[PDB]
């Protein structure tokens, strides 16, 4: 009797038709996921937004419950699993050091990195795999620059962080040693920035103060690693998805070639339109009985709030299925909302603006080097994107 | 400048959002297929119906053209490769023998075969592969019945026919040997039926006459074996896809369990809704310059008419993306239209109605035996449906 969920087919970026049907007829409904408990699905923009910004919906039970999810393991911990007030303290300290200014300051280095990755693609010659060569490379190198990892070490961060990808084919024993080595490096680097501060993020976290608090050694170390993981896969996938769309939606490519000044606005409109997630935001749990648009969610029931479906909700975005690079307003939920709203978002926007800008500067004739019927899509089951994008230009 | 086409991915039944965009803004557009010549893609119901019904679009050049298509080899020949008047002669004789009345008379043996397969499937315990044990078994056995293959040879016949499926893992030599034996067998049976007529279809085809004309020895053979192939894979795949939908859409399962008399209507509505083909109907070729929606289609250009998109057109079907078993009217194009309209359609309706009726009658708790997200999909590249459907009940 609950619907089998996810609805989205991972082999592509198409929004499941069942969402539009639910948004009209059963905006809060019962779903059964591949693993974990039955849950409530929330689909409309107002409701998704209410849920994510209502402190009555918490994340803390995720530490002990059998969470609704697509994969048999549970991934627990980090900032996304924490509730106010301990969440709030870490976040206040991180957003103090990790500011929009600091994001903006990395644009010139992000462009240099993107151009170097295109040079390497030019050198290997066509067709070249935009996924392996650019999308999987840029986000992790940019995050290494943000944190302050010396560039001599960026190659091997890339290799370690690759073990933490939901698409990775690694043994659990290889992934564990990748994690031990990553942590050991970062703990060492935090210790070097303590004794001798630089202008990088690790130094600024070591010395951030709020009221009278500061991050502890372990907090620093978890938060640095977390930012790397949080920052990598989601950015890589969304680059791969945006290029894929530029290659398959010709009116969109033409527009941004004609008017590159529309790129920042195009990044917001694609973040809105691409239903990136296979399913929803990580489950929230009702702290007490709450009524949501006539349906009572009892205390402790999990809620799956779809930002995907929300961002395509006709009541909020007129002609919601149209990509309109000049759409205003565009208050989308693609970076979340409320206390857990993406703290990487100013940087992710810079990376996505730079990726588009540079790719269209360098490879304006870019297109798929294979038929779409032969694209391989990711079956990681967390985000939707291509495994390889062979391109010609 | 042409888009790559097909847009659909093979691994599911998702209808590409680009189809709706083209239906609104570019209902006749240039595309490039994975193999063969560039072509015109037609997507509105009116237009696809007009193409398929209009004698100016012929199939004869398929015999010598580099046809737009999804697999490297070409499958040419059979009735579908013919034009009036030779097509007309063959068809008139076939539908003389192969009547709606003959197809209905097979309902009670189809039910018996279906119960037998349910019994065999139940005996292998749960979970059971609904595809291998039921969907790939019913259509070929019923075509065997239709033709008058004696029931003792259905198992061998099923093994030969199996070699012709687009999913088949056979070598070239294996497929040739299967064809050669299937030809000799069918040859032998035709001769046996000429000497001693029975009430089966092979007998009716030997005896059928029209304006004093009749089928030759070679024609009969190729029509007989042609009916087996046209009738096997498509009905098997549509069984699999209908049952997959019933197991994943609980309200649809519920309505048909409550009201089995809705089944006929449901088979129509699902035939409409399911974009069974990866791509379009096989290409038609304009005999002379034709205008279609104000775009000039030059003589000889291939024309890809998407019955998948047509059946999903909002201009024809209110709420076209919604499955409504009581949809009326439902003038869908899932069995083609015009002179090459599916001539097995009455029998396919019988098989699909029987497949639903017997499974829901015997296994009313049937449901997936693994998460939908873990289903494996066919990569035959022609029709879409699951490779395997582990079920429990
Ligand atoms: C897809 C991105 C997402 O990926 C993840 O959640 C990472 C998932 C991988 C698959 C995990 O590794 C697997 O663990 C299994 C026990 C064995 C698998 N192999 C060995 C066979 C192995 O691959 C986790 C456990 C890996 C470790 C290093 C980890 O904790 C990674 C965390 C990273 C989380 C993320 O990078 C960020 O988390 C996501 O952030 C989004 C913004 C949230 O919306 C949400 O997205 C779905 C949330 O997803 C759970
Ligand atoms: C998707 C359904 C479609 O299947 C097909 O079209 C299936 C075609 C498969 C994919 C082909 O098999 C491949 O051939 C390759 C050269 C090698 C591959 N292996 C060995 C690596 C092999 O798998 C073709 C060649 C199979 C042969 C036996 C064949 O001619 C099959 C024809 C079957 C046609 C169909 O079963 C039905 O299509 C029929 O096509 C005829 C040509 C038409 O006249 C018409 O039949 C009346 C039409 O039905 C309405
Ligand atoms: C296109 C790229 C990105 C997308 C689409 C994205 C999306 C999101 C979303 C939707 C959330 C909220 C999840 C929820 O509430 O369930 C989130 C949180 C978060 N993001 Fe991102 N993100 C991206 C890039 C980044 C980057 C580059 C970083 C770091 C540099 C980052 C760091 C984080 C962290 C640490 C959280 C947890 C915040 C908290 O719980 O307080 N993200 N992101
Ligand atoms: C659900 C199963 C079936 C579906 C969805 C289906 C669909 C179709 C379609 C859409 C066409 C027209 C294709 C075109 O014009 O390009 C066609 C043709 C054809 N069908 Fe079927 N069909 C099915 C079952 C059957 C069966 C059981 C038989 C045999 C008894 C059969 C025999 C044929 C033949 C011989 C043709 C070619 C007709 C001609 O060219 O004149 N089909 N079918």
With helix as H, strand as E and coil as C, how does chain A read? CCEECCCCCCCCCCCCHHHHHHHHHCCEEEEECCECCCEEEECCHHHHHHHHCCCCEECHHHHCCCCCECCCCCCCCCHHHCCCCHHHHHHHHHHHHCCHHHHHHCHHHHHHHHHHHHHHHHHHCCCEEHHHHHHCCHHHHHHHHHHCCCHHHHHHHHHHHHCCCCCCCCCHHHHHHHHHHHHHHHHHHHHHHHHCCCCCHHHHHHHCCECCECCCHHHHHHHHHHHHHHHHHHHHHHHHHHHHHHHHCHHHHHHHHHCHHHHHHHHHHHHHHCCCECCCCCCEEECCCEEECCEEECCCCEEEECHHHHCCCCCCCCCCCCCCCCCCCCCCCCCCCCCCCCCCHHHHHHHHHHHHHHHHHHCCCCEECCCHHHCCECCCCCECCECCCEEEC
Task: Please name every residue paired with B57 in a beta bridge, in sequence order, or none if there are none.
Answer: B286
Q: Whole-angstrom Cα distance, residue A323 to residue B149?
A: 56
Q: Is the CB of A363 under 6 A from ligand 1?
A: no
Q: How many CB atoms lie within 10 A of CB A212?
A: 5
B374 interaction partners in chain A (CB closer than 8 Å): 34
Strand ranges (E), chain B:
3-4, 28-32, 39-42, 57-58, 128-129, 284-286, 290-292, 295-297, 302-305, 367-368, 390-392
B5 interaction partners in chain A (CB closer than 8 Å): 372
The token pair that represents B296 in the structure block: 């000039």
Instruction: Spell out the SS3 assignment of B187-235.
Output: HHHHHHHHHCCCCCHHHHHHHCCECCECCCHHHHHHHHHHHHHHHHHHH
DSSP conformational letter for B322: S
The answer to whether the beta carbons of residues A227 and A344 sit under 8 Å apart is yes
Three-state DSSP state, B102: helix
Task: Report yes or no: B211 at the A interface, CB cutoff 8 Å.
Answer: no
* CB pair distance less than 8 Å for A35 and B373: no
Strand order of the β-sheet with A128-129 is A128-129, A390-392, A367-368
**Closest C-alpha to ligand 3, atom 19:** A342
- Ligand 1 centre distance from Cα of residue B265 (Å): 45
- Whether the ω angle into residue A291 lies within 30 degrees of 0, i.e. cis, is no
Mutate to test the pocket of ligand 4, among B234, B279, B309 (most ligand atoms within 8 A of CB): B234
Residue in A374, A376, A373, A372 with CA at minimum distance from that of residue A387 = A376
DSSP conformational letter for B74: -
Interface of A with B in 86-125 (CB under 8 A): none
The token pair that represents B254 in the structure block: 């519920």
The answer to whether the beta carbons of residues B49 and B310 sit under 8 Å apart is yes
Beta strands B28-32; B3-4: pairing state: parallel
B102: phi then psi, degrees, rounded to nearest 5: -60, -40
The answer to whether the beta carbons of residues B70 and B334 sit under 8 Å apart is no
| Geometric angle at alpha carbon A4, from B257 and B349, rounded to 5° | 40
The answer to whether the beta carbons of residues A85 and A58 sit under 8 Å apart is no
Q: Domain of residue A34: give its range.
A: 1-393
The token pair that represents A357 in the structure block: 């800008």
Q: Is B211 left (phi over 0), alpha (psi -120 to 50) or beta?
A: left
Nearest CA in chain B to A382: B373
Task: Report yes or no: B371 at the A interface, CB cutoff 8 Å.
Answer: yes
- The whole-angstrom distance between A336's CA and the closest CA on chain B is 25
Torsion sign across C-alpha atoms B255, A310, A337, A292: negative
Q: Which residues line ligand 3 (CB under 6 A)?
A: A 52, 79-80, 91, 143, 226-227, 230-231, 234-235, 238, 276, 281-282, 307, 334-336, 340, 342-344, 347-348, 352
Task: Report yes or no: B373 at the A interface, CB cutoff 8 Å.
Answer: yes
The token pair that represents B7 in the structure block: 């847009």
Q: Whole-angstrom Cα distance, residue B382 to residue B75?
A: 11
The answer to whether the beta carbons of residues B378 and B385 sit under 8 Å apart is yes
**Closest C-alpha to ligand 1, atom 19:** A172
* CB pair distance less than 8 Å for A12 and B10: no
Q: Is the CB of B383 under 6 A from ligand 2?
A: yes
B11 interaction partners in chain A (CB closer than 8 Å): 9, 11, 377
Rounded to 10 degrees, what is the CA torsion of B352, B358, B360, B364?
-150
The token pair that represents A42 in the structure block: 């929330």
Nearest CA in chain B to A70: B373
Interface of A with B in 302-341 (CB under 8 A): 321
Beta strands B28-32; B39-42: pairing state: antiparallel
End-to-end, the C-alpha distance of chain A in Å comes to: 50
A239 CA to centre of own chain: 10
Count of CB contacts below 8 A, A vs B? 73
| Geometric angle at alpha carbon B221, from B215 and B226, rounded to 5° | 105
Q: Whole-angstrom Cα distance, residue A251 to residue B280?
A: 24
* CB pair distance less than 8 Å for A21 and B322: yes
How distant, in Å, are the alpha carbons of A85, B324, B334, B383 from that of B307?
Answer: 57, 19, 6, 13
A17 interaction partners in chain B (CB closer than 8 Å): 15, 321-322
Atom of ligand 2 nearest to the CA of B76: 42
Q: Tell me the structure's resolution in angstroms, rounded to a single decimal.
A: 2.0
- Residue identified by tokens 């075509």 is B143
Q: Interhelix angle for A154-162 vs A138-147, to 10°?
A: 120
The token pair that represents A63 in the structure block: 């530490």
Q: Which residues, at least 6 apart from B73, have a Cβ–Cβ distance to it below 8 Å?
A: none
- Whether the ω angle into residue B355 lies within 30 degrees of 0, i.e. cis, is no
Q: Whole-angstrom Cα distance, residue A364 to residue A270?
A: 19
> Which one of B4, B36, B250, B258 would you mutate to disrupt binding with A, by most A Cβ within 10 Å of its Cβ?
B4
**Closest C-alpha to ligand 4, atom 26:** B231
Q: Whole-angstrom Cα distance, residue B237 to residue B251?
A: 22
B64 CA to centre of own chain: 24
* CB pair distance less than 8 Å for A17 and B321: yes
Residue in A229, A236, A256 with CA at minimum distance from that of residue A130 = A236
Torsion sign across C-alpha atoms A178, A383, B130, B148: negative
Q: From the CA atom positions of chain A, what is the Rg in Å?
A: 21
Q: Whole-angstrom Cα distance, residue B215 to residue B90?
A: 8
Torsion sign across C-alpha atoms B285, B291, B292, B295: positive
CATH at residue A219 = 1.10.630.10
| Geometric angle at alpha carbon B227, from B224 and B230, rounded to 5° | 150
Q: How many CB atoms lie within 10 A of CB B107?
A: 17
Residue in A266, A246, A280 with CA at minimum distance from that of residue A383 = A280
Three-state DSSP state, B162: helix
The answer to whether the beta carbons of residues A1 and A30 sit under 8 Å apart is yes
The token pair that represents A290 in the structure block: 């709450």
**Experimental determination approach used:** X-ray
- The whole-angstrom distance between A276's CA and the closest CA on chain B is 15
Strand order of the β-sheet with B302-305 is B3-4, B28-32, B39-42, B302-305, B284-286, B57-58
Q: How many CB atoms lie within 10 A of CB A47?
A: 21
Q: Whole-angstrom Cα distance, residue B232 to residue B141?
A: 9
Q: Which residues, at least 6 apart from A207, have a Cβ–Cβ distance to it below 8 Å?
A: A197, A214
The answer to whether the beta carbons of residues A298 and A290 sit under 8 Å apart is no
Q: How many CB atoms lie within 10 A of CB B122?
A: 14
Q: Which residues, at least 6 apart from B276, have a Cβ–Cβ distance to it below 8 Å?
A: B234, B237, B238, B241, B308, B334, B383, B384, B385
Number of domains in chain A: 1
Please check if A77 is assigned to a binding site: yes
The answer to whether the beta carbons of residues B125 and B192 sit under 8 Å apart is no
Three-state DSSP state, B69: strand
Q: Whole-angstrom Cα distance, residue A380 to residue B7?
A: 22
Torsion sign across C-alpha atoms A393, B3, B4, B8: positive
Q: Is the CB of A345 under 6 A from ligand 1?
A: no
- The whole-angstrom distance between A35's CA and the closest CA on chain B is 8
The answer to whether the beta carbons of residues B356 and B112 sit under 8 Å apart is no
Please check if B376 is assigned to a binding site: no
Interface of B with A in 238-277 (CB under 8 A): 248-250
Q: How many CB atoms lie within 10 A of CB B46?
A: 14
The answer to whether the beta carbons of residues A114 and A354 sit under 8 Å apart is yes
The answer to whether the beta carbons of residues A31 and A57 sit under 8 Å apart is no
Please check if A115 is assigned to a binding site: no
- The whole-angstrom distance between A194's CA and the closest CA on chain B is 47
Rounded to 10 degrees, what is the CA torsion of A124, A129, A130, A135?
-110
Q: Is A372 left (phi over 0), alpha (psi -120 to 50) or beta?
A: alpha
Q: Whole-angstrom Cα distance, residue A300 to residue A13?
A: 32
Q: From the CA atom positions of chain B, what is the Rg in Å?
A: 21
- Ligand 2 centre distance from Cα of residue B75 (Å): 6
Mutate to test the pocket of ligand 3, among A244, A345, A354, A384 (most ligand atoms within 8 A of CB): A345
Q: Whole-angstrom Cα distance, residue A228 to residue A223?
A: 9
Task: Report yes or no: A24 at the B interface, CB cutoff 8 Å.
Answer: no
Beta strands B3-4; B367-368: pairing state: unpaired
Beta strands A3-4; A28-32: pairing state: parallel
Task: Please name every residue paired with A42 in a beta bridge, in sequence order, or none if there are none.
Answer: A28, A305
- Residue identified by tokens 């890809």 is B304
Residue in B107, B209, B228 with CA at minimum distance from that of residue B157 = B228
Residue in A225, A192, A205, A180 with CA at minimum distance from that of residue A79 = A225
Q: Is the CB of B226 under 6 A from ligand 2?
A: yes
Ligand of minimum distance to the alpha carbon of B93: 4
Please check if B154 is assigned to a binding site: no
Q: Which residues, at least 6 apart from A211, have a Cβ–Cβ distance to it below 8 Å?
A: none
* CB pair distance less than 8 Å for A248 and B4: yes
Residues in chain A: 393
B274 interaction partners in chain A (CB closer than 8 Å): none
A34 interaction partners in chain B (CB closer than 8 Å): 371-374
How distant, in Å, are the alpha carbons of A311, A351, B192, B312 from that of A17?
Answer: 14, 31, 53, 12
Please check if B87 is assigned to a binding site: yes
The token pair that represents B256 in the structure block: 């048909």
Q: Whole-angstrom Cα distance, residue B214 to residue B206?
A: 8
Q: Whole-angstrom Cα distance, residue A40 to residue A305?
A: 8
């Amino acid at each position: 009797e609950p619907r089998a969920y996810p609805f989205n087919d991972v082999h592509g970026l198409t929004l499941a038709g069942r969402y539009g049907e639910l948004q009209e007829t059963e905006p809060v409904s019962r779903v059964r996921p591949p693993y974990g408990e039955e849950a409530w699905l929330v689909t409309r923009y107002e409701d998704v937004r209410a849920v994510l910004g209502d402190g009555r919906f918490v994340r803390g039970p995720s530490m002990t419950r059998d969470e609704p999810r697509t994969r048999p393991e549970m991934v627990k911990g980090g900032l996304l699993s924490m509730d106010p007030p301990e969440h709030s303290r870490l976040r206040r300290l991180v957003v103090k050091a990790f500011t929009a200014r600091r994001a903006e300051s990395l644009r010139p280095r992000a462009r240099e990195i993107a151009h170097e990755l295109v040079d390497q693609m030019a050198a290997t010659g066509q067709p070249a795999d935009l996924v392996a060569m650019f999308a999987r490379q840029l986000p992790v190198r940019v995050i290494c620059e943000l944190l302050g990892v010396p560039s001599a070490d960026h190659d091997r961060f890339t290799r370690w962080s690759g073990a933490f990808l939901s698409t990775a084919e690694v043994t659990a024993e290889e992934m564990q040693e990748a994690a031990e080595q990553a942590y050991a490096y970062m703990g060492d680097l935090i210790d070097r920035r303590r004794k001798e501060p630089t202008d990088d993020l690790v130094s600024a976290l070591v010395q951030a103060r709020d009221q009278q608090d500061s991050l502890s050694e372990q907090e620093l170390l978890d938060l640095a690693i977390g930012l790397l993981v949080a920052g990598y896969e989601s950015t890589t996938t969304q680059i791969a998805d945006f290029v894929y769309l530029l290659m398959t939606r010709p009116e969109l490519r033409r527009q941004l070639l004609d008017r590159p000044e529309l790129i920042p606005s195009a990044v917001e409109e694609l973040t809105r339109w691409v239903p990136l997630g296979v399913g929803t935001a990580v489950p929230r749990y009702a702290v007490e009985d709450v009524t949501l648009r006539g349906v009572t969610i009892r205390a402790g029931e999990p809620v799956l709030a779809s930002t995907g479906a929300a961002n395509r909700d006709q009541a909020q975005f007129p002609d919601a299925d149209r990509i309109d690079v000049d759409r205003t307003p565009n208050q989308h939920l693609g970076f979340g909302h409320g206390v857990h709203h993406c703290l990487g978002a100013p940087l992710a926007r810079v990376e996505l603006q730079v990726a588009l800008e540079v790719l269209l500067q360098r490879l304006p004739g870019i297109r798929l080097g294979i038929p779409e019927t032969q694209l391989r899509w990711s079956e990681g089951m967390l985000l939707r994107g291509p495994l390889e994008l062979p391109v010609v230009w």
